[PDB]
Write a protein that binds this DNA or RNA. Structure first.
Lengths: 279, 53, 249, 93, 131
RNA sequence: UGGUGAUAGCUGGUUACCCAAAAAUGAAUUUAAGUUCAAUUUUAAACUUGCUAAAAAAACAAAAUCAAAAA
RNA sequence: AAGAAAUUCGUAAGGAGCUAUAGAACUAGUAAAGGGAAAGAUGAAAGACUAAUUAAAAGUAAGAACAAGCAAAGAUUAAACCUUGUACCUUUUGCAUAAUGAACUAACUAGAAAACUUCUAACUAAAAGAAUUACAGCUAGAAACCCCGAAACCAAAC
């Protein structure tokens, strides 16, 4: 038997490391974990964002219906975030629509609604909250915090932010934190468009423009198993959009998609949106 | 440092301890642990500034 | 003492805090790892006393000028070191300090310089030479121990025939010297320097200065064959007639 | 190699026991006792090395002299053989 | 008493090895050192390959427009253009219209350069050859 | 069985880090694997010119040996 | 290499050891002189059904393999493809496509001395707690030089 207690203590740590790797512990909310002060964190959270929040309002926004039930159950053996949630979601819809309209006046009202819904989507809201540690600050009876409950708080925080800092700061906050999520997102990715050829024709007739005549601009490897077809939409014998496709149908569909982006001013070379403006 | 950076929650817990240690937690969930055993004030200040940045 | 004040400010010291002085201890190499892994007796050994060395003792008051100089007293004052293991057999004087030692006192040294003898006599000192057996001299340097051993005081030995002429020589002023030549010899030395001879009799303390022990007598105070009641701080004298014959022998 | 799967029981040691508390007391016996008793006189242990130290050969040789007559015949012969090796090593290498 | 952990240090780097090498400390230690040294040597050579790749891509892009790489570089140098090879590859890939403009600019300077060389400097410097 | 860990100028082996400095000439030795002498290197100390270069002058016969001043 | 004396002097249970390859060869001198081992592990209680504890050695299984190659590196969307690369120690010479040695795992396995000097201090014409040196000396401390292996030789028993 080897002598010494350090060696025995060292092996115990060695055993613990192996056990932890084999069986990682279940997740627990930071609130239960040590070194958590809700009041201190909220003050730091507001200062960290460099934004002014009303402590009472912000706490109410964090407060959720599920959290109250757990406390009420313990109490048996308080203001929800619904009111703030409605204000933030409603205000965000107006603010998001306003931002979209300015950049893309050509884009149809239907498209703006899809974009607004995508930006207010549960996944988008949840991702921002988790990366900001809002989930730890979120008050709920279950961990990991349910996504619908987490989404409610985020807009509730926006509603609290509106009261504390006004629409102007909240609008900058939305632009700084939410409009940034549109980077790298293609138009059809955020807005679902089916039957692009029909939609393209529908826009053209509204503008009193002749439907383009599809033509095969380029062709390669037609008889091989890997054929490449370029189809160009010619309006009044003038090419408006061209797309590549493995088949003539695919190229025509891709060309239609390119035209739709051009119609609504979503060109790949379009002017970038600006987050620098302090105004 | 606390006045300069009030957005970071600082916990100071003098207790019977073999080796002093500093734990830094980030918003994304990253946590970094640094032992302060037998280190001078100047060394500690430089380390904390790096953690903040 | 500002250093003392710093101690008060500094924290209380503990056993662990103690640390060896810088550079006091060198490092060592041990084979733990690859660093140390891989690969004449007959001639007397006179022990002299310099005149300059003599001068400071008198000037510093280490040896009382009134008391005659005694080799044992010098050992008592740690003036000179005699080692029996070295088998030191004699005592001499060193020419150093001939120009820095102006004083007069009675003294006895086993060997003295002829120039030094007259110079101190010119100053008024009394100088003589006595023979101490090297074993007896060691006993003389350490008188208490043989009392502890219980040995009685023996008769002082005489020089071997090689050294008899030196001690018997009148000019050498030895205890075996002929007294008849001493008044003439003293006169002759005075003429050599030309200094006015001070007769030993003129001195008020003449008897004290001229007092000398018997050739058989080791100690000025104690006659040969005596015993000392060291425990009772008394001196014991043999009262047996046969013992007197032994001392005469 | 393999290591223990159990932790040893905790142990507590008293540093102020009389032996530790009074360790070193009377070490100044000579200076504070008029030098009547030298601190070397306070050494208790093997007779041949009380107040004395030397190299291994000197210690062995002194040990033989002190207890040679009181040592066992077998031990004395072994000590004699051991002394031979020690003598050659130090005095020839 | 830490000899086990010393082996673990070698083993942790040798966990991904195959064969008895991954489980033999005698062989595992040798493999770990050899792996580390190989990366060190490649660091210096790695940079040279990247420049070679950039130059090769530029030549193909220039040849696509019908311009040789050496001719394109020399004319750009004559025009005091200091764009690096890495940026040049990006311009062709992501700015084909700009690359053609660069191609046209280099060819025009090449035509002016040939005229200047034939002229011997007696003729006035061309508009694109003016500094 | 013990002397005995015999002896062997011979074979082989001889376990953590970092910084710094660092070259197989002459003479002899039962000596050419070692050792002494010169030379090198090296530490301390004393105090002042040193290295490269270097004309004329000799030496030779009618860029080195030597070494003014410089730089 | 050996090595006196004379002459002085001399009263009077513990471990900065080991803990089953360590420590006595030992659990044991047990299993012709003589030589001489191997090994065991529950709990308070087994009149509680005999204990647990360990991604923990190599070896295997769970789960064989897929053109290209000292087996890795740079990489990469990608395990293999592309690119780069003459196993290790010792020894030769500052070179091996020489030559030795290695099935693998665990344990065990080889630098030891103070005469003089420098350095660190005490006191100082004196220094050392007897035996030592001295015209700045003297005292104390620190500072150093391995392991295994013959053919042989002799004594006493059998």
């Amino acid at each position: 038997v080897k002598k010494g207690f350090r060696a025995a203590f060292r092996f115990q740590k060695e055993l613990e490391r192996w056990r932890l790797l084999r069986c990682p512990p279940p997740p627990v909310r930071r609130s239960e974990k040590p070194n958590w002060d809700y009041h201190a964190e909220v003050q730091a959270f507001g200062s960290r964002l460099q934004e002014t929040f009303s402590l009472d309002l912000l706490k109410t926004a964090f407060i959720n219906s599920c959290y109250i039930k757990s406390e009420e159950a313990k109490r048996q053996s308080l203001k929800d975030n619904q009111e703030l949630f409605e204000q933030g979601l409603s205000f965000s819809h107006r603010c998001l629509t306003q931002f979209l309209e300015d950049e893309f006046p050509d884009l149809p009202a239907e498209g703006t609604e899809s974009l607004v819904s995508f930006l207010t989507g549960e996944a988008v809201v949840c991702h921002v909250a988790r990366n900001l540690a809002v989930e730890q600050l979120t008050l709920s009876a279950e961990f990991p915090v349910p996504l619908p409950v987490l989404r409610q708080t985020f807009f509730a925080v926006i509603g609290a932010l509106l009261q504390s800092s006004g629409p102007e700061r909240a609008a900058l906050f939305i632009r700084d934190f939410l409009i940034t999520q549109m980077t790298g997102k293609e138009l059809f990715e955020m807005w679902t468009v089916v039957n692009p050829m029909g939609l393209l024709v529908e826009e053209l007739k509204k503008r009193n423009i002749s439907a383009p005549e599809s033509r095969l601009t380029r062709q390669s490897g037609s008889t091989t198993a890997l054929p490449l077809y370029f189809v160009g939409l010619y309006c009044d014998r003038k090419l408006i959009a061209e797309g590549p496709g493995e088949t003539v149908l695919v190229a025509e569909e891709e060309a239609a998609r390119v035209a739709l982006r051009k119609l609504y001013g979503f060109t790949e070379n379009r002017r970038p949106w600006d987050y620098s403006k302090p105004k | 440092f606390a006045r300069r950076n009030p957005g970071v929650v600082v916990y100071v817990n003098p207790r019977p301890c073999a080796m002093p240690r500093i734990v830094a937690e980030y918003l994304n969930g990253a946590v970094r642990e640094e032992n302060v055993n037998s280190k001078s004030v100047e060394e500690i200040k430089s380390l904390v500034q790096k953690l903040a940045d | 003492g500002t250093s003392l004040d710093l101690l008060r400010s500094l924290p209380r010291v503990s056993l662990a805090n103690l640390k060896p002085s810088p550079n006091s201890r060198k490092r060592e190499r041990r084979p733990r790892d690859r660093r140390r892994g891989r690969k004449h007796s007959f001639r007397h050994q006179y022990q002299p006393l310099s005149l300059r060395r003599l001068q400071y003792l008198i000037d510093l008051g280490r040896v009382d000028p009134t008391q005659p100089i005694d080799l044992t007293q010098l050992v008592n004052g740690r003036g000179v070191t005699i080692q029996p293991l070295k088998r030191d057999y004699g005592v001499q004087l060193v020419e150093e300090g001939a120009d820095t030692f102006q004083a007069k006192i009675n003294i006895e040294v086993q060997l003295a310089s002829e120039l030094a003898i007259a110079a101190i006599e010119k100053n008024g000192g009394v100088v003589t030479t006595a023979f101490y057996d090297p074993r007896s001299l060691e006993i003389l340097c350490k008188p208490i121990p043989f009392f502890l051993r219980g040995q009685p005081i023996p008769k002082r030995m005489l020089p071997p025939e090689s050294l008899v002429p030196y001690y018997t020589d009148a000019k050498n002023r030895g205890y075996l010297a002929d007294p008849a030549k001493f008044p003439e010899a003293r006169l002759e030395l005075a003429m050599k320097f030309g200094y006015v001879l001070p007769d030993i009799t003129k001195d008020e303390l003449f008897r004290m200065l001229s007092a000398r022990k018997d050739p058989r007598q080791i100690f000025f105070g104690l006659a040969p064959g005596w015993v000392v009641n060291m425990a009772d701080k008394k001196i014991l004298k043999p009262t047996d007639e046969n013992l007197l014959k032994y001392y005469s022998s | 190699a393999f290591v223990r799967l159990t932790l040893p029981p905790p142990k507590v040691v008293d540093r102020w026991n009389e032996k530790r508390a009074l360790f070193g007391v009377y070490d100044n016996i000579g200076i504070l006792g008029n030098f009547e008793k030298h601190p070397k006189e306070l050494i208790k242990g093997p007779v041949w090395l009380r107040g004395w130290r030397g190299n291994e050969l000197q210690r062995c040789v002194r040990k033989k002299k002190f207890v040679g007559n009181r040592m066992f015949i077998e031990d004395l012969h072994n000590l004699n053989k051991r002394i031979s090796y020690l003598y050659k090593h130090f005095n020839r290498h | 008493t830490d000899r086990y952990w010393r082996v673990q240090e070698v083993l942790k780097h040798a966990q991904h090895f195959r064969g008895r090498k991954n489980r033999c400390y005698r062989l595992a230690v040798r493999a770990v050192t050899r792996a580390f040294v190989k990366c060190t040597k490649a660091r210096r050579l790695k940079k040279r390959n990247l420049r070679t790749l950039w130059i090769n891509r530029i030549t193909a892009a220039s040849q696509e427009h019908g311009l040789k790489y050496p001719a394109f570089i020399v004319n750009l140098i004559k025009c005091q253009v200091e764009l690096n090879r890495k940026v040049l590859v990006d311009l062709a890939i992501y700015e084909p219209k700009t690359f053609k403009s660069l191609a046209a600019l280099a060819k025009r300077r090449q035509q002016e350069g040939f005229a200047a060389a034939l002229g011997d400097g007696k003729e006035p410097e061309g508009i694109f050859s003016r500094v």
